[PDB]
Amino acid sequence: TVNWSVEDIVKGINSNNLESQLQATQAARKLLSREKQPPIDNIIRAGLIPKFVSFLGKTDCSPIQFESAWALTNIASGTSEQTKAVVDGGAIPAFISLLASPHAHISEQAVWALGNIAGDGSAFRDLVIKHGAIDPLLALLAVPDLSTLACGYLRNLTWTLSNLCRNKNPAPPLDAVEQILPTLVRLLHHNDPEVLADSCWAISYLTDGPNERIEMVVKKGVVPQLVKLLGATELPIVTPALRAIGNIVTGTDEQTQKVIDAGALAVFPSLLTNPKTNIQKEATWTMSNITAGRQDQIQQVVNHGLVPFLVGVLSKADFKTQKEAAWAITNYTSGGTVEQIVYLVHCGIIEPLMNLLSAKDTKIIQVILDAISNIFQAAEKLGETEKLSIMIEECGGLDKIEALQRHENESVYKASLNLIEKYFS
């Protein structure tokens, strides 16, 4: 019951009376579940964790199993030090044993607890896996139709599975990922918004790594569903779906092509103008890795009408987004055909590119100077350098370039002078 002192909780838990122990454990749970500043450290210092862990095994008193599971879940929701206290008390195998509880609310609470422990970081994630958590977790989801499961239960299962997919140095064990993926792909087709969001997060973590990890995911055929979720009205779904798509196009040309083949580029007029600045940034970053691809992939960018959207972002966007756009342009001009590059200029890339040369940011200045060099090399292939030179002078570009001559950074000077020397002298 309500607002016990820690002193009274300890007295109750130290009684040799299981019903007294239950009342005291519920009182601890309520303290730990209040809105403001749960006294986690006070409960830890009182030495209560080993008793709570012992209560997880009291099969004939399912209420104290539930109450201690909740209390421990909330201690483990805290700092790494607080999560470690729960693990140090032997809680991981006790919670795994509760996954097979005939009481659904107790099984669910154990799922949640293991999610908190795994969510601490890669070491505790891997320790939860070594204790054998994955088989019984997946067994709870081995049903013909996920819709027969309680919505809250299914959401907790999905979230906990996503933490087993989360974090790097190291990434999760390859065999654990393979074991989880088929269930994860089913969750990715479930019609609940929170299950969809957490499934996308899981996929985004799994694709955040070397191309071999990306391939494990792409082979399971998820890209079309990711592209569908790219267009969800829910921002909590779009954000991780976009991260996952973005991760995939950091991969091989073939992996990138799967994204293009599933129709992803048709969603980018909206993504590149999205009111959430983080979405615009991630979408432009994604575009920059696609224009880093083959000439036929650059051509698909052109065919979907996306070069004017890059011109737009270069013209006006949050500065970090403009940066990604500069990179998209330098990549485009690096790998593209002469005709592709010419098309870029006709779309109006030069003036907004020149205006960003005012940036008090060294990296983007280098990136922009590189693109200009690239565009000049295409123009002389057509023997039209002065024509481009004129365009740069008129919009004030030449002024900035000969300003970048007095610049502090090595490579910026050399790039600036060489431009002046070859095309403006």
Binding site: R29, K30, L31, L32, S33, R34, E35, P38, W70, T73, N74, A76, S77, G78, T83, Q109, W112, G115, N116, G119, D120, W159, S162, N163, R166, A197, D198, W201, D208, T239, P240, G246, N247, V249, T250, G251, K276, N278, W285, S288, N289, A292, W327, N331
Partner: peptide, 27 residues
């Protein structure tokens, strides 16, 4: 070439991300 996802000083979740831990409320 391809830029793999980067570490910005605060851009792991960057507050638009997924909760790695959750406390159960109502008591």
């Amino acid at each position: 070439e391809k830029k793999k996802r980067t570490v910005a000083e605060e851009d792991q979740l960057h507050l638009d991300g997924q909760e790695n831990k959750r406390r159960r409320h109502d008591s």
